[PDB]
Amino acid sequence: AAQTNAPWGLARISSTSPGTSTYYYDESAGQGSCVYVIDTGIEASHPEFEGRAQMVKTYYYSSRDGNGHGTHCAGTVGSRTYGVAKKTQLFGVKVLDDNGSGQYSTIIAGMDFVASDKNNRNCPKGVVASLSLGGGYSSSVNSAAARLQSSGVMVAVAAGNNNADARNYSPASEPSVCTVGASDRYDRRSSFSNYGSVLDIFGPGTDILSTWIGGSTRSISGTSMATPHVAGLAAYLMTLGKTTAASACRYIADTANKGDLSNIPFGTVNLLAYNNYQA
Numbered sequence: 001a002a003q004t005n006a007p008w009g010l011a012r013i014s015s016t017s018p019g020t021s022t023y024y025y026d027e028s029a030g031q032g033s034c035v036y037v038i039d040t041g042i043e044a045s046h047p048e049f050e051g052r053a054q055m056v057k058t059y060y061y062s063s064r065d066g067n068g069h070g071t072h073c074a075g076t077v078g079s080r081t082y083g084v085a086k087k088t089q090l091f092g093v094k095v096l097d098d099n100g101s102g103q104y105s106t107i108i109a110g111m112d113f114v115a116s117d118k119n120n121r122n123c124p125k126g127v128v129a130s131l132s133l134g135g136g137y138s139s140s141v142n143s144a145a146a147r148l149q150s151s152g153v154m155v156a157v158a159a160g161n162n163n164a165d166a167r168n169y170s171p172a173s174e175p176s177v178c179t180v181g182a183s184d185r186y187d188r189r190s191s192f193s194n195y196g197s198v199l200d201i202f203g204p205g206t207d208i209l210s211t212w213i214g215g216s217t218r219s220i221s222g223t224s225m226a227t228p229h230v231a232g233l234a235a236y237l238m239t240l241g242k243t244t245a246a247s248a249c250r251y252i253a254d255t256a257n258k259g260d261l262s263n264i265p266f267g268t269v270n271l272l273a274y275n276n277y278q279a
């Protein structure tokens, strides 16, 4: 399948070169997979989600996304126009309030929720969780992310936007999950992207167009935007039967575009998420 005039990040993820504008992918499109977006919520009524998104949990007075961030990330995972895995099932878990803030205890509870809740969902092709969030190092936050991964969920987490070593942030620093840095449309490490040995992969993160609340769209930047590219890529590959939740991060690293990013600090992987789709 070919989507013309796609957001640059989608085109990037199916290309061996920067500078193109068509996204190419297998029509299976993540059907039969599930992605949990653990964030500020998802505006499930957005036409871009086509009835494939729903809120399954909130820790606040509403499950509505009053911020936009979770909706944007969910759109990069699975919206019809802005998404990597255009037929996946999207599940919103609102651990972040409408200001985009959340206590670590809430975030941990949300991760343990997803590990159990997947057993209440139909995801025959497998389950992914996208965590575009983080704070300072916490062993308990890392452990929760490790449990979620261990439970059979492909966990993708933002490296963080501090232009610093991700070793000092959680859940970024949890080794067993997939820690995602950000790149721009010219294949530079994004200016704000964290780096370090703990990164597994980079995805598009600067100037990413996606869904927003009020049935809208906008472009924003962050490792928060790179993460759902990788989460959607995992769901797509799992639907194709090419990998599993336990092995998807490794598979993505194995099959990445290698050595093509600039301003990657010595000791950080130079690997850019790539679907290796050939028609």
Ligand SMILES: [Ca+2]
Binding pocket: 174, 175, 176, 177, 178, 179, 198, 199, 200, 249
């Ligand atoms: Ca890792």
